[PDB]
């Protein structure tokens, strides 16, 4: 049934979990006590770049999915690269990570080759967050609470202007 907390996510049965459980799997904390956190940053309204219509569908979908997977989801919208940095730094400082076993970070915006566009981005005055900065803010040095724990980063954005295709004949 989809009426449960896991919604439309297919459940892993007790017998299938034991079939998987190897010494090469990340440990899962007790469901009763764990405090899983996830962060979604989605830029829809921009100063100079066209409106990202349909972004609300992405927000709804990802928020519900991560909740289904057991994560408490923070949603932050329409941020500059500076604001995204401040938000990432605050997320890294969250006390819940200490009693968590993993995290998800979701970024959704316009993008270029260099990285992810902030709300104020233009070709004249770039407002970009690099993927490198995301890793740095979440690593063992800057986020010791997530040491040894899977950190999953999801990015929806262009990485350039090319259609990504080439022709071939049969």
């Amino acid at each position: 049934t989809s009426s449960g907390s896991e919604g439309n996510v297919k459940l892993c049965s007790l017998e299938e979990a034991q079939r998987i459980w190897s010494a090469e799997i990340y440990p899962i904390m007790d469901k009763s006590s764990r405090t899983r956190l996830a962060l979604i940053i989605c830029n829809e309204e921009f100063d100079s770049i066209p409106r990202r219509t349909g972004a609300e569908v992405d927000i709804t979908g990802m928020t519900m999915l991560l909740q289904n997977l057991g994560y408490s989801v923070d949603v932050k919208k329409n941020l500059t690269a500076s604001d995204m940095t401040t938000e990432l730094e605050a997320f890294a400082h969250r006390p819940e990570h200490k009693t968590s076993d993993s995290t998800f970070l979701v970024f959704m915006s316009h993008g270029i080759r260099e990285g992810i566009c902030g709300k104020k981005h233009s070709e004249q005055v770039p407002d970009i967050l690099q993927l490198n900065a995301i890793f740095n803010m979440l690593n063992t040095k800057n986020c010791p609470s997530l040491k040894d724990k899977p950190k999953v980063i999801i990015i929806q954005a262009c990485r350039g202007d090319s259609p990504g295709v080439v022709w071939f004949k049969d």
Partner: protein
């Protein structure tokens, strides 16, 4: 007592396209990568680790249409398999 730990470990990034290339978003249906990811997570979280799920997402994009993209995993330092064990 103090001990050394790797500064960067247990990361996985998953991007909507390859470098230089566009990613597509439907005005009413949402981002293609996002929608595809949710469907695969809903179906395969029970049986597959995250790296395998992301591989499956990549496979689903294989046959290119008028609006093509190939998602890519980046800067991966997962040392173990990450199973979500949904329901547990």
């Amino acid at each position: 007592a103090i001990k050394k730990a790797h500064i960067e470990k247990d990361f996985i990034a998953f991007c909507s396209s390859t470098p230089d290339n566009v990613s597509w978003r439907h005005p009413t249906m949402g981002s293609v990568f996002i929608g595809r990811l949710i469907e695969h997570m809903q179906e395969y979280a029970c049986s597959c680790d995250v790296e395998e799920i992301f591989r499956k997402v990549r496979f689903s994009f294989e046959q290119p249409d008028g609006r093509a993209q190939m998602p890519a995993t980046e800067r991966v330092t997962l040392t173990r398999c990450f199973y979500l064990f949904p329901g547990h």
